[PDB]
């Protein structure tokens, strides 16, 4: 079993880096999600049910916010859960299908500063024997050693030589990771509200550089998730030199990165952190 | 005559501000009603003849409503009318009784965006000398300025230098109110449905984070109407730090605030502003 | 109109050396400021349309970033922009309705490696003919010839014989201009991150001796912005002699001096430039 799974838990969608042995593949889907099992006849989401949480996960949720257009996310979630846990689970029965696989190496990711935070959320709902029932089918596994980890310090594997700042642009979230050498500066890094979705790249923008003035404009800074290589544009419109996107390698656009960089960059660390 | 009156046109039940010159009492009632005059030798309910609608009003509604538990209510108005006009007749009314006083200072309350249309809808149907009969009773009176607010606004008077948001968990309407310095923000700001009535309050509080992620979680948030003290709880067990409910001061329920907060923390300017 | 306009576009607050003839008196103001117009009955900040861009400014500003306690500032500002440009708007605005008058005689300061780039910035968005809407009040106006200048320059009137070096302690900028009898010696002087804001007196202190240990400890030493006198205190027990804070001869205390003190030295100077 084991399988290292790194799962970003992401306000508009989540992903998974899904090593596969030879090349890491990413189990992703969309993070919108609704309450309630007993609608009929469906189709499309998947009733998922667990730790006494009932909701609907998949593509089709959008259809259940039809008109609703702005309950369909919840973001901003400076720390995991509610709605998290069940992107977890669902991603966990989705890689599980994918593997055939149980027991789970279970690594997360979310703003830095709720990691302790997160750590006891997902640890208290998560660590250890759990099972799931999706769509009237059960489902029993585990994890033995949640690791926690900063949103979006994956990008770190692109980030050539970075002492310095990592820039995260998701949904409704902003991460930005003063890395120093190869950690990170509690005492300087920090999240900021909103995104991508609630505002402009531009004011995002602006909104970070009023939050991080003390950033040389010479700093390396590598933009990361959803509108990365639109942001990293912006940036240097604002005036920022060395910034640039962290293009993940394949086809596979930006907002993947995160989960998957941190799996390519850490992944033996995790190998021992985990065992 | 003057009289201010700050009326709150409740979907589960109205109120209002009873300045009542040393101490503001409230002229609530159940805002349920019923259509059709001729029942025969009846009581309880009083019949409502206004701008040719027909409907009885007052406590014993429920009994004509009994096993349709469901019609009881005309919720998520993101507006007013129609039904609403016989609410504030009959509240007009009440408060005629109580006062024994024609000319009302109306002060009309409704969710934030539909204001405009508010206006227009009781100016047309309101403003200025107009009469009803009740139970067989007739009375002329008027109003010269109606006012219009925000529903939910009044909290303010106990939102300690709020300069963000006023939820309002009102049967099935949810307000909030972003709020700034001490004025509304259009662009953020929103009415949402449900509310207290359809689902939990867990469910509205969680509607709530989805349609407000760009709220931070040390956001002064001012919980008013129905159950809100319950919902501040639910809030707090969401995430929500400094969160609090609108007590009123004396014992005067939740619900009781919205217009009598108004009352209370505006009134003044009303005085200018109906004058 | 000429009017001699040397105005300071400081990142924690603005302002004007209004020679007023007889005295020179000073227009500022708070340089916080925040996007988008449409708010709502409001008062406070004034909105601010220039160049398609739209901003709020004014004191009440704090409160629109109300626990945002960070975004407040846009400084480390090595160039001018792009708020900047707002900054200067509402102070050539302040300064209109002060006198009642148009044309300006624009001069600027700022870091004095960025002097080239920020004249091409100003230039651009400010050079002849431009027009502003503030609160809806259209407003037409022009400059013809913007001087710009090293900022903290202005302190050279106090500084006594100077053949030396001027320290800049202002919001999250540190500026050190090494004077030489009367000239910027380019190959010495420079700008540092961040400021007065974001570390103590004494981190900026040690910072700065770090970045000039090229000074003799008996080097004049005249220390102007902020916490002007802290700073010159503090760099005595770093162990400077001859360091001294340029008092505003009035009661104006340190922040004003700058652009004040530019104009009370030079003036006739830019008289003969700008003309
Ligand atoms: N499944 C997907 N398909 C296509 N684009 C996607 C998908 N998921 C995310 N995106 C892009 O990514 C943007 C938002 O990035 P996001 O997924 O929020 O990053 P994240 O870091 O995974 N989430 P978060 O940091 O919590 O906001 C979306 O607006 C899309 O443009
Ligand atoms: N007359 C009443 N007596 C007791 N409780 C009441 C009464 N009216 C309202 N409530 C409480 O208030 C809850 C609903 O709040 P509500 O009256 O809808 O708030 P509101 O803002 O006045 N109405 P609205 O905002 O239009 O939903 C009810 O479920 C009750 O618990
Ligand atoms: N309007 C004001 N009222 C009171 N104190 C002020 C005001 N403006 C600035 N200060 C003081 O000046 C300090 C910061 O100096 P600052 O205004 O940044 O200098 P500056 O040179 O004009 N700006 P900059 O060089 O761009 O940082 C503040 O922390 C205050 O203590």
Redesign the pocket.
Known sequence: MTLTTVI????????YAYKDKKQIKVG????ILHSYKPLEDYEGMERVEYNGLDYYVGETVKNFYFGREEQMYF?N?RKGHMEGQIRLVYALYTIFKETGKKEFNLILTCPYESMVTDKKYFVQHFEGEREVIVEGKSFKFTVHNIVMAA??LGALNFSDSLNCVIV??????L?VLYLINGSISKMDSHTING???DNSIMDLAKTFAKTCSNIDYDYPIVC????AEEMKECLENVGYSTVSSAELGEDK???YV?SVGLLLKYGRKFEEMFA
């Open positions: 970003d838990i992401g306000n508009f969608s989540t992903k992703s889907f969309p993070s973001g979630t949103e979006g995260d642009a998701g949904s409704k979230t991460n995104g991508t979705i990361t998730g959803g509108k656009p930006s907002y995160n």
